[PDB]
Design a protein around this ligand. Structure first.
Ligand SMILES: O=N[O-]
Ligand SMILES: O=N[O-]
Ligand SMILES: O=N[O-]
Ligand SMILES: [Cu+2]
Ligand SMILES: [Cu+2]
Ligand SMILES: [Cu+2]
Ligand SMILES: [Cu+2]
Ligand SMILES: [Cu+2]
Ligand SMILES: [Cu+2]
Lengths: 336, 336, 336
């Protein structure tokens, strides 16, 4: 397309929403290609990641960890206005794994505190993709400080299974998984720092052990539980997008399955089916489609159970509806 | 189907056998859907896992680590009677990843010592699936104490390749891989405990390093080597079911291949072919089909070779038959 | 084929080149099956792997880490003459994951210093495969000392996508990724030794932590950068073969994609497409095909960013050509 043709395309400004929710969109594209506009302000901010009060100096796109899910359709253009407020202290940028050129956009979006930039790229490939900050020489530190999220590039005709049958979800959730490396003192207690820079040296030492102290969903142990548990109903079709920008994960819906899973996150790659536990490598996003069949509470976890239950990688789903005794029944309840 | 229809299905009791062997079954279903009954007694007992007398207080379904492989066909019902003797000290339950609802059955099978329960579930999806104990609040501790196994839900018409041709094995083995986390004193010696609970704190500390002290097959270093090597003959077709309920593994048959590998373990997902090393994520089972072409001793390992040869994840296959010089030949033996 | 039939086949002597380059070959087979001859001399030598002068006692096939890529076609025979110079101190052998029998050839190629051997095997399965040394009792030590490489067994008809359309590359690069476990002294300084055997005990203790001190490409931090950055031009199709003989990796071309990726490395397994980050388990090789569309510098990394940017797993591609503003453009460059 020529600059003239792109300039003639319609523009649509989208208001982002905080994970695990996803901004309104249509699965099947409405009309032809458009330039979809998003705006995100970067906030370096202290966040608490567990019940003990452990703090992390997060580097957050749009103020959240993970950053929000941006949704467009194949061949649409995503135009991001990225702002680094003067209140921040570090330079930041953004690398869209969905984009082509200049290190995912990283080479064209380096902004110091007090600056902004607008990047536009054509979303030529359909799938879910990670996006993350990557300042030369300080790449992993920004990413494991929570500066990452994902986008979804839907095929213009929506999702289909491996044989061409349409797959239409009733609702979608975006689960961003984050590995944190928090320094500890001599008593094994997590340390707190005044400014982000103060924690750098101590944090890199922990990062080098390749052993996170916390592995969480939506920025904190238990973030997606209780009144923040995800919800569904028997018969409801749910797409769960999951990302991990730095480390491998293996999602599992306890009590359910992944009916169709684009484990690589790419929609032109046929989805695996009837999955118990799928695998998403560090640096990628994946998506699982499931139709709930039983009511009750479900856990959704990274299936290295130590990471799930000791480190924080566990969420819950509350599901309404009628119990199905054909699928499962307690013939004899626990008894002597 | 109707309530009367389910109640009218035949019921069949099957006797289990210890891993790596598998109980009698037919690859193609015999007759229509049935309710297949199994019974397993849980045994908490000390087992020695290496050549230095290292002990683990195992939590073993049917007295073995891994628990036995249960085999049924798609749309049969699996009805398990699970028994927790009064001589045990902990509450246990079971989550079948093959099942749908109540956390895989975990929510309906919590049995204290002195209790039993009977769970029935319809095996709606074909494939090999992990099953494991999962008491709320102590899930990884039970799983890494060896309380896990797998089941195989065969398609009613048996296995097929990606093109629809039948794949009929001559024999099948079940290799359960276990990551253990045994505490050590300050001198580096593995600690011993009187009761399972006594080791809880020390064990969770090791678990949090995400670094197992041992990674073994069939519950101990060298359990499937030497006089306990698995066997085959040139020309024989073998299915090797492999599971890991908590941590990733990458099986490899040294000197062989995985001709067809359902790496995700699900039969409706076409198998990868001609594999050198496949990948099974923690929380899943996989299956590899191979026709032996050469006689001799083969090693079968988790291909992180440190895990295989330093930590214990190495098994052997002893294969009889005629050597094929076309496939391989020493043109010039080692010589000065 | 009979011994006589094999004896009658034409032979072709190949001259190997140092990674990441690949020796001359034809994608589509030129004529019928042949016996392709290769010769490699094993060199035990010191290599410096980081800018702090850290040393590793490398055990290098052909004198490099990784060993060179050998290319043949399906059903050709690969005849390797392996030499262990009297100047070396250890016995070595070779296991080709591409081969069938005798532990991949390892059981037939054990040569002490001063000996040589000639092994011939039929390349019956198409794809990229790892090859590595594996002396009984000291397998991982040789592999993590850099004694591994890969070979590519091309289909006779060249590469094809999942629907049969031909995929012909303009350039091919071989990236061998190595996990190193270098002992440190009481002050965190890396130790040096005057003999390979002298570091054995210290090295095994680090290996057991399953935590590498370095993760590098072509044997050293920054190896494939600067004077060694890989090159291409906009419009060129490039195949990147990547192997890791002992530990998992997750390749990612920063600013690009894996248009077609045989993640399992096997050509009869259809490639995944539009990949952002692919996964190669320890003990395997994989291959990604990409057509460059933007000029500039690209980073190529293992996407656990700590492994890439703290431990050393990062390479660069320098691409020439015209920038494409349709694919990506800076609407507003970084500014106040
Ligand atoms: O089935 N998840 O523990
Ligand atoms: O080919 N197994 O080391
Ligand atoms: O997109 N690689 O950090
Ligand atoms: Cu940043
Ligand atoms: Cu990235
Ligand atoms: Cu238990
Ligand atoms: Cu589970
Ligand atoms: Cu060697
Ligand atoms: Cu190997």
């Amino acid at each position: 397309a020529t600059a003239a043709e792109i300039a003639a395309l319609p523009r649509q400004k989208v208001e982002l929403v905080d994970p695990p929710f996803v901004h309104a969109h249509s699965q099947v594209a409405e009309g032809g290609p458009k330039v979809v506009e998003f705006t995100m302000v970067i906030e370096e901010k202290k966040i608490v990641i567990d019940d003990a009060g452990t703090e992390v100096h997060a580097m957050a796109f749009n103020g959240t960890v993970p950053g929000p899910l941006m949704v467009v359709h194949q061949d649409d253009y995503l135009e991001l206005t990225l702002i680094n407020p003067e209140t921040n202290t570090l330079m930041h940028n953004i690398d869209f794994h969905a984009a082509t050129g200049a290190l995912g956009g990283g080479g064209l979006t380096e902004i110091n505190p007090g600056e902004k930039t607008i990047l536009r790229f054509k979303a030529t490939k359909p799938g879910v993709f990670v996006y993350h900050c990557a300042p030369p020489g300080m790449v992993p530190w920004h990413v494991v400080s929570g500066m990452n999220g994902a986008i979804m590039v839907l095929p213009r005709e929506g999702l289909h299974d491996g044989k061409g049958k349409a797959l239409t979800y009733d609702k979608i959730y975006y689960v961003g998984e984050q590995d944190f490396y928090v320094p500890r003192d001599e008593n094994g207690k997590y340390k707190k720092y005044e400014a982000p820079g103060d924690a750098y040296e101590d944090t890199v030492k922990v990062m080098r052990t390749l052993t996170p102290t916390h592995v969480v969903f939506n920025g904190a142990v238990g973030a997606l539980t209780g009144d923040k548990a995800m919800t569904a109903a028997v018969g409801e079709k749910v797409l769960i997008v999951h990302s991990q920008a730095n480390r491998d994960t293996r999602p599992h819906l306890v009590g359910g399955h992944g009916d169709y899973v684009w484990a690589t996150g790419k929609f032109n790659t046929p989805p695996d089916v009837d999955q118990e536990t799928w695998f998403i490598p560090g640096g990628a996003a994946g998506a699982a489609f499931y139709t709930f069949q039983q009511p009750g509470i479900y856990a959704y976890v990274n299936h290295n159970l130590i990471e799930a239950f000791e480190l924080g990688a566990a969420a819950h789903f509350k599901v309404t509806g009628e119990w199905n005794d054909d699928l499962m029944t307690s013939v004899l309840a626990p008894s002597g």
